Structure formats: structure tokens, C-alpha cells
């Protein structure tokens, strides 16, 4: 189940200055970058155009190109419409896309965050405020819902254009998505917290456990999944032990890249 994300982030410092940058993810892999400086959207994968024709992508890029400008003036006008109830600096994020499921099944989303808090979502045919959101947002919402063009466009994009495009992406990016990368493991200790460093594995699912021969340790504490530059994963596991207990122990790593060939690393 791959989740497709178009991540927009807009900074409004004062009444005049502002910028908007976008990044696009299919799963844990980046497909597009759209910097504020770049008038056009940039592909970050050879397969980022999915199964779309050149005309189709162009009609779709031009649509977004207009949106970015439209969005910039619109916020500034909504700030004026609200003032003094809202004030600069203003920080707005958008998480929009569609998650894919077996068959031709998918669910689309458009989530808007105001000042680091999730406040607004597009649902069905209209914009609405989420629970917890302030009541003054009802007016901007009403105004956006007045615009029937945007509503029709967003419905098409969320209902049709998102899942159609991602179904095309999965075919074009199979080799990169279904790619397998072997993890590399090394050990260290710190004043002793025994660490099992694991790096360079793809996909993201992994199994790293400390074992005293067969004894799966109850004190194994897995850390956070941290990224690498070459689009692979890094993770570490810290064990809580006393001095002298260094020998006799090992770190075992299970991954799809090895296929039964479990890495076992003795200290």
C-alpha cells in the first residue's frame, strides 16, 4: 500500500514577502521538486512523468503554475479579510495526494495546516474545517467554497487525476520501487550501551534484534528510521547491559534483500 504525497509549504513573512516550495513523494521516494525559484516542476526520477503523455503533463504543470500565483494572492487577501484576527508571519502547509490499494481502489486527501496545526481539509465536494480549528476560519472557508471552478478542479484531481497518475507511476518506477538493497552492520559501545548500527537497506521494513545465541533480548531498544543520501535507510539498536557481558552476544538482521541469508554479527 503506497501513499502518494504532494507536500506544499508556504511562508508569508509580511504583507509583501512570501515563498512557496513543494516536494512530491511516492512512498519513501521523492518523485518531484518544485522550488519557488523554478517556474517549472522538476523531475527527480527518470520515471516521474508516470504514464502521462507530454501534452498531459504540460496541461497539468500549467494548471499548478497558475495555482501557485493564485494561492499567493489569495492568502494575502484572506489575511486582509481577517485582520486583525490573523497576523504575519503566516506558515501554511498542504499534504495532498492519494493512497493506493489492491485492485483499482484508492482514497484521496487534501489537508491544510495553518501555523503548524491541521485546520482544513477538502472533503467530497467542498472545503471544511476540522475539529479543533478556530471559528474565524469559517469565512475563508465560505469564500473558497464560493469558487465553483476550484471545487470542480479539485474534485477531478482528487477523484480522477491522482489515482490515475499514481497507477501509472507504479508501472514506470517498478525497478526503483521494488528495488532491494543489502544492509551493512557494525557494532560499538558507549559509557555500556551496546549499539548495532544498520545502514543501506531498502525497502524500509527491517528486523534488527540482539540475541545471546537464541535469546531474543528483552532490553533491545530500536531507534528511529533515519535516511541516507543515496535513498537507503539507516537504523540503530541500543542494548542496556553491564560491564564484562560484551562477549557471547550477537546482532541479527533480517531483510528482504538477503532472502533467508540473515546477517549475524558477533562481538
Amino acid at each position: 500500500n503506497y501513499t502518494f504525497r504532494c507536500l506544499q509549504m508556504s511562508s508569508f513573512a509580511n504583507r509583501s514577502w512570501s515563498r512557496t516550495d513543494s516536494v512530491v513523494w511516492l512512498g519513501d521516494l521523492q518523485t518531484h521538486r518544485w522550488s519557488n525559484d523554478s517556474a517549472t516542476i522538476s523531475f527527480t526520477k527518470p520515471w516521474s512523468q508516470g504514464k502521462l503523455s507530454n501534452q498531459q503533463w504540460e496541461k497539468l504543470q500549467h494548471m499548478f503554475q497558475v495555482y501557485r500565483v493564485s494561492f499567493t494572492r489569495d492568502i494575502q487577501e484572506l489575511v486582509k479579510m481577517m485582520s486583525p484576527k490573523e497576523d504575519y508571519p503566516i506558515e501554511i502547509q498542504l499534504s495532498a495526494g492519494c493512497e493506493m490499494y489492491p485492485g483499482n481502489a484508492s482514497e484521496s486527501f487534501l489537508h491544510v495546516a495553518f501555523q503548524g496545526k491541521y485546520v482544513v481539509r477538502f472533503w467530497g465536494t467542498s472545503w471544511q474545517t476540522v475539529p479543533g480549528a478556530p471559528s474565524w476560519l469559517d469565512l475563508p472557508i465560505k469564500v473558497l467554497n464560493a469558487d465553483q471552478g476550484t471545487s470542480a478542479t479539485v474534485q477531478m484531481l482528487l477523484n480522477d487525476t491522482c489515482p490515475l497518475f499514481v497507477r501509472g507511476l507504479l508501472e514506470a518506477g517498478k525497478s526503483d520501487l521494488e528495488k532491494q538493497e543489502k544492509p551493512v552492520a557494525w557494532l560499538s559501545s558507549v559509557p555500556r550501551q551496546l549499539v548495532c548500527h544498520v545502514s543501506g537497506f531498502y525497502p524500509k521494513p527491517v528486523w534488527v534484534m540482539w540475541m545471546r545465541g537464541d535469546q531474543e533480548q528483552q532490553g533491545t531498544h530500536r531507534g528511529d528510521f533515519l535516511p541516507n543520501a543515496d535513498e537507503t535507510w539507516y537504523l540503530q539498536a541500543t542494548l542496556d547491559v553491564e560491564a564484562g557481558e560484551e562477549a557471547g552476544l550477537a546482532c541479527r538482521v533480517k531483510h528482504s534483500s538477503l532472502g533467508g541469508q540473515d546477517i549475524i554479527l558477533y562481538w
Epitope: 486582509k80 479579510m81 465560505k142 469564500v143 473558497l144 464560493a146 471552478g149
Partner: T-cell receptor, first 111, second 113 residues
């Protein structure tokens, strides 16, 4: 929807204070001040998103705007000039795109 | 000036048809509206076009919108003496109150009785 303007027609002197009024009982949040000049289309001067609000338009110089209430939106010319001789149009509207225009105000500033 | 009207002025005889042009570069083009302004009077709306390819008709008035060409025409069928007025093209950049309207200078029409 109805929008009224007062006065309908006005003659003023350079340096004098002139207040053009606009009344709307449509309960519209938004109200707009334009001027019409031969050779140009209507150009925006000032606009308000509700009581208290006022925002500069495309050509705001020489004009001050006041929105005392939902009902009324005034254009104030502090020190009148012959360059401000024009037909001034007022418009109002809700959250939709439709702007409902008043009858229009002819202003003539003489020396 | 993102809105341009043609002709600047024209003179027709009672009964004949006349077509009025409007070309614009306004981005985006949500809707286009036609106004009739009798000399000294205010702005009477004639019609409003909204679709990518659009056609409307209000009595003897009929207008067409082609957004791809960013171009619009207003045909007046069987002109009457009453039609002597300036006809104004107006493009709005949003489908809500966030929009700003962009006004053409107007095509002048004089109908000979």
C-alpha cells in the same frame, strides 16, 4: 440587490474636502470604490471586507476610505484636485464573484 | 491594460447587425461579463460567460467565450436606436470574492435612426 450613492452629482473646489457616500442594505461584507475615465476602464481605488476594514486598490493616491459600518462605505478626498475629476462608481458583493454597482457619481473639481 | 476592445467605435444603421470584440491576457480567466452603459447612465449587465467554450443569449444580445484564445465576441442582432451606448468587457480572475475585476475601455456604438 440594490446599491445607492450620494451625492449623485457634485461640484467642488481645489483644496476642499469631498466625501462620496455609498449605501447598501444587501448585508454584503465587501464594498469597492472605482473611478471611470474616458480612455480607461474602471480602476480600483479602495475596498473593504467589512466594518472597520479598508484596503488600498490599484490607484489609491489622493483618496482615503472609511467603512463605519456594513451598510456604508465612504470615499474621502482630503485635498481635492482637478486630476480627481471623474465619474466614481461604488460596488458591493458577498463571497461570490458578482459585484453590484451603484448609479455613479460625477465629480468636478474647479480651480 | 490586460483587456482590449475592438473596434474603438463604430456607426451602424437601424436594423443591421454588429459584432463587438474583446481580447484579454488576464490570468486566470474565471468569467467574462458584458456591460451596457448609456451615456451618463450606469452599468447594466448584459450577460456573463464562464465556460472554456461558452455561448449565451439575452434577447437580441448573444455572446461567445473561447478561453483558449482568451477572446470574446458580442453580437447584436437587429440593432435598435436604444443600443446607442458604450459596451464594456470585464474579466474576473477568481470565482469568489478574492477576485479582482479587469475592465476594458469599452466599444462605442452609435446607431443611425
Amino acid at each position: 440587490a440594490a446599491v445607492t450613492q450620494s451625492p449623485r452629482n457634485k461640484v467642488a473646489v481645489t483644496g476642499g474636502k469631498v466625501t462620496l457616500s455609498c449605501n447598501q442594505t444587501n448585508n454584503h461584507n465587501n464594498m469597492y470604490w472605482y473611478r471611470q475615465d474616458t480612455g480607461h476602464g474602471l480602476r480600483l481605488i479602495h475596498y473593504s471586507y467589512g466594518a472597520g476594514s479598508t484596503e488600498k486598490g490599484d490607484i489609491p493616491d489622493g483618496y482615503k476610505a472609511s467603512r463605519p459600518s456594513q451598510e456604508n462605505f465612504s470615499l474621502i478626498l482630503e485635498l481635492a484636485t482637478p486630476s480627481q475629476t471623474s465619474v466614481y462608481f461604488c460596488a458591493s458583493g458577498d463571497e461570490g464573484y458578482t459585484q453590484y454597482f451603484g448609479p455613479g457619481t460625477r465629480l468636478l473639481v474647479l480651480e | 491594460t490586460q483587456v482590449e476592445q475592438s473596434p474603438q467605435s463604430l456607426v451602424v444603421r437601424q436594423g443591421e447587425n454588429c459584432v463587438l470584440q474583446c481580447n484579454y491576457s488576464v490570468t486566470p480567466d474565471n468569467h467574462l461579463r458584458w456591460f451596457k452603459q448609456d451615456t451618463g447612465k450606469g452599468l447594466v449587465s448584459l450577460t456573463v460567460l464562464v465556460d472554456q467554450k461558452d455561448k449565451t443569449s439575452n434577447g437580441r444580445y448573444s455572446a461567445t467565450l473561447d478561453k483558449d484564445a482568451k477572446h470574446s465576441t458580442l453580437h447584436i442582432t437587429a440593432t435598435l436606436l436604444d443600443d446607442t451606448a458604450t459596451y464594456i468587457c470585464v474579466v474576473g480572475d477568481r470565482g469568489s470574492a478574492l477576485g479582482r475585476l479587469h475592465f476594458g475601455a469599452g466599444t462605442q456604438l452609435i446607431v443611425i435612426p
